[PDB]
Amino acid sequence: MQIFVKTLTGKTITLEVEPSDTIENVKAKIQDKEGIPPDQQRLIFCGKQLEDGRTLSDYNIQKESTLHLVLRL
Amino acid sequence: MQIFVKTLTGKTITLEVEPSDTIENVKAKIQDKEGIPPDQQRLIFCGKQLEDGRTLSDYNIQKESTLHLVLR
């Protein structure tokens, strides 16, 4: 399925994912698209920061849902 | 500011809004774009259906945030 990741530069990234993908797996997909190491990524969905060892489905992130990326200070 | 409204047809509607806009005002803006009467719209943000008399800001809906439209 597709999900979207919006950045503070006003970009929208489209990712190809499965619901059982871990957040860590999603950060790897963002690294593929943007070159940002996973350790520099803060991913947020509906106001909550996401944990690397949990899945998309653990957070009820569904097809065509939008996450937010913030780089760590 | 801009917000987005995604539909079940896969469309993404861009709206121009202010944070103090009521949800009813937002439904009017969707009517402008799609012709859907406000009474036929269910608007959802982060899993919660939105009340007509409350504002975008009441729900913490920010610039470039995405809502979901489901028809009744």
Residue numbers in the entry:
A (entry chain B): 1 to 73
B (entry chain A): 1 to 72
From the paper:
Post-translational modification of proteins with the small protein modifier ubiquitin (Ub) regulates many aspects of eukaryotic biology. Ubiquitin phosphorylation is emerging as an important regulatory layer in the ubiquitin system. This is exemplified by the phosphorylation of ubiquitin on Ser65 by the Parkinson's disease-associated kinase PINK1, which mediates the activation of the E3 ligase Parkin.
Ligation went to near completion after 2 h incubation at 25 °C (as determined by LC-MS) to yield ubiquitin with an Ala46Cys mutation (UbC46), or Ala46Cys and phosphoserine at position 65 (UbC46-pSer65). In our structure there are two symmetry-related Ub molecules in the asymmetric unit (RMSD 0.081 Å) in the P31 space group; this differs from the previously solved Ub-pSer65 structure. However, the two Ub molecules form a covalently linked oxidised homodimer (apparent from the contiguous electron density), linked by the two cysteines arising from the Ala46Cys mutation. Structural conservation between molecule 2 in our structure and the reported structure of phospho-ubiquitin was high (main chain RMSD 0.659 Å). In our structure, which is at a higher resolution, the γ-oxygen forms a more favourable H-bond with the amide nitrogen of Gln62 thereby forming an H-bond analogous to that in the wild-type ubiquitin structure. The orientation of the phosphate thus appears to be dictated by a solvent-mediated hydrogen-bond network involving Thr66. However, pSer65 does exist at a packing interface and is directed towards His68 of an adjacent Ub molecule.
